Structures are given as C-alpha cells and as structure tokens.
Design a protein around this ligand. Structure first.
Ligand SMILES: Nc1ccc(CNCc2cncc(Br)c2)cc1
Length: 93
C-alpha cells in the first residue's frame, strides 16, 4: 500500500506551464527553510532546481512513467529523464 511521501521517493511533479517533470522528494537540511503545511521539497532532475509542492501535484514514478516519461524539447527535461532512470539518488548539487 502507498504511504505518505518520504525522502527518496521518485515522482513526476507538475508545475503550471511545464510538463510533468521527473523529480524526487528531498530531505530538509538543518536550519534550512521548511515547506508550508502539507508541502514537500521537490528536487527536479535535469534542471536541478528545488520547489515546495503539495501531494496533488506529485505522481509516483512507476505508475506514471508510461504517460509522462517521453522525451521533449524543454531545457533539462531529457537529462532529467536520464537521471531519474539511471541514478535517481545521487548528489547533483
Ligand atoms: N521557486 C520556483 C519558481 C519557479 C520554478 C520553475 N523553474 C523552471 C523549472 C525547472 N525545473 C522543473 C520545472 Br517543472 C520547472 C521553480 C522554483
């Protein structure tokens, strides 16, 4: 059965203006800014940016990869697809 999102979970994350984007649930460092209520730090593969999103915008990776994993022209997208498929838990900073 599913659980609440935890650090390391792999998703596609949706933001307005962008296709569903390969991402992971990140940890919160000490003293860093914490997310708003019921939001999570989302690390976007490829672009290597982080945003706070809620679960309604987070789609578990294996269930959604057939629908959202197709290559496209957006900057960083294809590299993000490679990262989530080949080394999704590595350090990209
Ligand atoms: N605070 C904040 C504002 C906007 C952005 C969107 N940046 C472009 C982008 C990069 N990777 C994945 C996607 Br989807 C979109 C991110 C964070």
């Amino acid at each position: 059965m599913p659980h609440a999102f935890k650090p390391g979970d792999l998703v596609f994350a949706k933001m307005k203006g962008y296709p569903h984007w390969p991402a992971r649930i990140d940890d919160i460092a000490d003293g860093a800014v914490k997310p708003p209520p019921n939001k999570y730090p989302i690390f976007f593969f490829g672009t290597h940016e982080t945003a706070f999103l809620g679960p309604k915008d987070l789609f578990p990776y294996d269930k959604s990869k057939d629908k959202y994993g197709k290559p496209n022209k957006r900057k960083g997208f294809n590299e993000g697809l490679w990262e989530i498929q080949n080394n999704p838990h590595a350090s990209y900073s």
